[PDB]
Design a protein around this ligand. Structure first.
Ligand code: NAG
Length: 182
C-alpha cells in the first residue's frame, strides 16, 4: 500500500478534514491556496491561486474510492475542494479546464465530486512526495477513463498578465505541505 500523506506535524492526512496546502518554503515561495477571478473587471469564474503570504483557505480532500481508515495516500486519485463561501455560479471543487486570459490548462473551480464518465475525471488529482522536507506535489493523470484532451502533468504556479499566481499543469511542479486547520 502507498505510503500515507503526512501533515507538517507528522500525523497522516485524512479525507473529510480541513487542511491548508502551503508553500513548503518558509520566509519565501508564497503562502497557501485560495481562489480568484480573471483580474478583468469580470468577477467570475474563479481559478485556484496561491496567496503570496497567508496560509489561504481550508481545503478538503475526498476519496474517489471508499478508504477504510480514511487516510489519504500517495498517487491515489482524489477530489479537492475549498471549504468556503464563494459568490460565483460554480462549486468550490477543483478541476482542470481552460481559464480566461490564461494560456494552457488552469486549475479552476467548478469541479465534480466522484467519478462518473470522463468529465468527472478532470476533478481527480494525485498527490506525490516531493524533494523538500514534508513536501508533496499535485500531479494530474486520472486513473479513470477520460478523453485525450487534457495532458497528464504536474501543477506549478504561473504569473499571468496581472501578476497573479495561477495554478496550471506544466512540466515543473510546486511543492506544498499540509497543515491541519485546527
Ligand atoms: C468547513 O467549514 C465549516 C465552517 O464554515 C466548519 O464547520 C467545518 O468544520 C469545516 N469542515 C468540514 C469538513 O465541513
Amino acid at each position: 500500500a502507498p505510503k500515507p500523506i503526512v501533515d507538517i506535524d507528522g500525523k497522516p492526512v485524512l479525507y473529510g478534514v480541513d487542511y491548508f496546502v502551503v508553500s513548503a518554503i518558509w520566509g519565501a515561495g508564497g503562502g497557501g491556496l485560495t481562489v480568484y477571478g480573471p483580474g478583468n473587471k469580470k468577477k467570475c469564474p474563479l481559478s485556484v491561486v496561491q496567496d503570496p503570504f497567508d496560509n489561504g483557505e481550508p481545503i478538503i480532500f475526498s476519496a474517489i474510492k471508499n478508504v477504510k481508515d480514511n487516510i489519504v495516500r500517495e498517487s491515489v486519485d482524489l477530489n479537492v475542494k475549498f471549504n468556503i463561501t464563494i459568490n460565483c455560479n460554480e462549486t468550490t471543487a477543483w478541476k482542470v479546464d481552460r481559464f480566461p486570459g490564461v494560456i494552457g490548462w488552469t486549475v479552476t473551480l467548478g469541479g465534480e465530486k466522484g467519478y462518473h464518465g470522463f468529465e468527472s475525471t478532470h476533478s481527480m488529482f494525485k498527490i506525490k512526495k516531493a524533494g523538500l522536507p514534508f513536501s508533496y506535489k499535485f500531479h494530474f493523470c486520472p486513473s479513470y477513463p477520460r478523453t485525450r484532451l487534457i495532458p497528464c502533468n504536474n501543477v506549478d504556479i504561473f504569473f499571468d498578465k496581472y501578476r497573479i499566481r495561477r495554478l496550471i499543469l506544466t512540466n515543473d511542479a510546486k511543492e506544498f505541505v499540509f497543515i491541519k486547520t485546527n
